[PDB]
Amino acid sequence: FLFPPKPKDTLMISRTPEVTCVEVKFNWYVDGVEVHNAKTKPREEQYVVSVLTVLHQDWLNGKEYKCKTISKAKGQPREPQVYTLPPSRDELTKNQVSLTCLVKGFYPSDIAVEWESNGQPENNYKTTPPVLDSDGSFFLYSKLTVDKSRWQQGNVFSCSVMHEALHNHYTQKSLSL
Amino acid sequence: GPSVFLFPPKPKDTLMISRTPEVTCVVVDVSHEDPEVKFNWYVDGVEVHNAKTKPREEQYNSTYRVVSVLTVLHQDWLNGKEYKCKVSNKALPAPIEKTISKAKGQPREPQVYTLPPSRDELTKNQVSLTCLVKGFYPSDIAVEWESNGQPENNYKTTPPVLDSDGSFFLYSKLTVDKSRWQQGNVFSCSVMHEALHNHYTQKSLSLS
RNA sequence: GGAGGGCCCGGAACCC
RNA sequence: GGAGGGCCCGAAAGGAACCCA
Ligand SMILES: CC(=O)N[C@@H]1[C@@H](O)[C@H](O[C@@H]2O[C@H](CO)[C@@H](O[C@@H]3O[C@H](CO[C@H]4O[C@H](CO)[C@@H](O)[C@H](O)[C@@H]4O[C@@H]4O[C@H](CO)[C@@H](O[C@@H]5O[C@H](CO)[C@H](O)[C@H](O)[C@H]5O)[C@H](O)[C@H]4NC(C)=O)[C@@H](O)[C@H](O[C@H]4O[C@H](CO)[C@@H](O)[C@H](O)[C@@H]4O)[C@@H]3O)[C@H](O)[C@H]2NC(C)=O)[C@@H](CO[C@H]2O[C@@H](C)[C@@H](O)[C@@H](O)[C@@H]2O)O[C@@H]1O
Ligand SMILES: CC(=O)N[C@H]1[C@@H](O[C@@H]2[C@@H](OC[C@H]3O[C@H](O)[C@@H](O)[C@@H](O)[C@@H]3O)O[C@H](CO)[C@@H](O)[C@@H]2O)O[C@H](CO)[C@@H](O[C@H]2O[C@H](CO)[C@H](O)[C@H](O)[C@H]2O)[C@@H]1O
Ligand SMILES: [Ca+2]
Ligand SMILES: [Ca+2]
Numbered sequence: 001f002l003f004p005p006k007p008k009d010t011l012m013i014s015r016t017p018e019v020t021c022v023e024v025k026f027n028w029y030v031d032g033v034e035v036h037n038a039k040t041k042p043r044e045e046q047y048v049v050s051v052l053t054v055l056h057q058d059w060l061n062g063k064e065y066k067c068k069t070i071s072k073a074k075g076q077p078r079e080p081q082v083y084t085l086p087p088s089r090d091e092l093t094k095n096q097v098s099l100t101c102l103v104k105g106f107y108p109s110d111i112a113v114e115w116e117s118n119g120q121p122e123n124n125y126k127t128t129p130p131v132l133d134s135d136g137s138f139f140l141y142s143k144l145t146v147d148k149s150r151w152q153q154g155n156v157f158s159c160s161v162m163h164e165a166l167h168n169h170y171t172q173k174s175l176s177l
Numbered sequence: 178g179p180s181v182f183l184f185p186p187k188p189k190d191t192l193m194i195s196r197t198p199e200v201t202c203v204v205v206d207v208s209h210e211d212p213e214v215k216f217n218w219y220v221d222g223v224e225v226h227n228a229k230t231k232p233r234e235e236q237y238n239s240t241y242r243v244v245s246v247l248t249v250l251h252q253d254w255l256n257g258k259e260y261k262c263k264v265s266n267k268a269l270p271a272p273i274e275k276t277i278s279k280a281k282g283q284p285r286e287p288q289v290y291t292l293p294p295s296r297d298e299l300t301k302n303q304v305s306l307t308c309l310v311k312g313f314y315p316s317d318i319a320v321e322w323e324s325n326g327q328p329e330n331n332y333k334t335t336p337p338v339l340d341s342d343g344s345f346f347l348y349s350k351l352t353v354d355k356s357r358w359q360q361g362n363v364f365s366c367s368v369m370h371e372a373l374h375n376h377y378t379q380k381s382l383s384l385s
Numbered sequence: 386g387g388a389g390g391g392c393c394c395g396g397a398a399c400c401c
Numbered sequence: 402g403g404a405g406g407g408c409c410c411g412a413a414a415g416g417a418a419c420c421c422a
Contacts, residue, residue: 086292088309104350128335131334133333133352139333143346
């Protein structure tokens with residue numbers, strides 16, 4: 001089973017994207033050109049492993065990768081529309097409230113969404129997996145949970161989105177009372 | 178030998194008396210040497226005989242897919258009883274056993290919140306109506322939308338997502354023409370879950 | 386008219 | 402204090418977590 005890299009890895013440089021070709025003999029070929037930079041790990045049993053760190057720009061340009069071939073999903077990429085939604089008035093009676101980020105109209109589904117405040121990553125947030133919309137693109141929601149007081153006292157939060165179809169592959173939207 | 182898969186009932190089926198929940202045991206990868214398959218069902222150890230098996234199905238991949246459906250009782254499923262499906266085929270060393278049941282744990286009542294379109298989205302001709310459903314447990318749930326008491330079909334719902342507090346949440350998005358939003362239509366998000374009163378609740382949403 | 390381009394029949398869908 | 406009750410402690414019993422006025 002040949003697996004693709006993590007969207008973030010392919011998105012942010014700090015990380016390193018890699019493909020995985022999960023008496024074992026490996027032979028990798030990027031668009032044919034056999035390469036020798038792969039690396040494997042320990043082992044398992046019975047019937048594996050081995051990873052080829054790909055280059056951000058290569059994977060992005062849909063280069064082929066085999067050892068079973070694999071590459072970036074095909075189709076015209078579509079840029080995400082990012083919308084922030086404040087908590088429901090009904091949620092204002094709870095100790096914590098939900099700050100919502102809607103990300104829709106993107107393709108491929110490989111994306112990374114984060115929340116921050118004061119240039120610092122927020123901790124308590126969860127993002128749904130991408131969901132196929134009726135128009136061929138995907139959408140997801142990311143929920144930030146914060147103490148009710150951090151919201152009412154004016155703190156400003158930002159939803160950050162990274163995706164290949166975005167200018168500079170990144171965008172963000174803020175949210176505050 | 179062939180493969181086996183046990184499917185739980187539809188969340189909405191276990192929650193409404195007007196519906197009949199059921200468990201499904203599907204067997205694929207069945208050979209022709211012996212396309213004969215036997216099913217044995219057990220409810221918490223005890224074997225039951227009310228299962229309905231459907232005749233084998235010729236699959237494009239030159240194989241057979243055989244299905245057995247077992248009717249379960251609403252309260253049984255919701256109370257945690259386990260359902261075991263034992264398959265038997267000579268083209269298989271030992272009989273395959275699959276067991277399924279509702280997830281263990283204290284059920285939690287989902288909190289339902291409707292969110293209007295973002296001001297920025299109002300520049301579009303199409304807008305999103307959002308329904309946030311959080312804090313529920315187990316993850317089995319059903320979500321629907323209506324407008325003025327009538328069925329709305331243009332919505333997509335995310336799968337449940339495990340939250341940091343041990344509970345699940347999800348979002349449901351209904352897409353409507355901006356004009357219908359601005360004209361005062363009253364939209365409503367309906368949720369069905371065991372931990373809800375009467376297993377049902379709904380929140381309205383309309384232009385203020 | 387171009388030049389690009391998986392989830393309704395190479396195309397629709399999807400930067401000038 | 403009363404009653405229930407998978408995704409950190411505990412090897413596990415079980416508990417933290419999670420309706421009762
Ligand atoms: C080996 C080979 O080459 N032969 C082929 C067969 O393998 C192939 O059959 C498939 O085998 C796979 C095993 O390799 C199976 O993988 C497992 O898939 C399940 C998810 O299955 C869901 O969803 C599928 C699509 O999302 C759908 O196709 C399946 O039929 C099934 O749908 C659900 O069915 C149940 C049963 O009816 C529904 O139950 C509901 O129950 C309610 C109350 O009980 C109520 O009554 C409802 O009315 C009733 O429907 C349920 O609603 C359906 N849900 C959906 C999604 O619609 C997955 O969970 C498994 O995951 C686990 O196992 C894997 C290992 O693979 C692990 O990695 C995971 O971690 C999990 O542990 C498996 O992935 C696959 O399901 C089999 N598919 C079928 C059709 O049975 C056959 C059939 O191929 C189909 O597709 C094409 C090839 C086509 O050309 C046709 O052949 C055919 O349509 O083909 C060869 O024989
Ligand atoms: C989250 C996760 O578990 N995925 C990790 C792993 O996924 C395997 C996955 O295999 C998919 C299945 O596909 C067919 O439909 C099946 O019939 C099977 O053939 C096959 O299993 O799920 C199975 C369990 O069912 C299991 O083998 C794995 O969970 O795939 C990668 C490792 O095998 C792993 O990705 C890693 O490597 C990539 C590089 O490509 C990333 O850069 C990361 O380093 C890391 O995530 C993946 O996360
Ligand atoms: Ca095509
Ligand atoms: Ca435990």
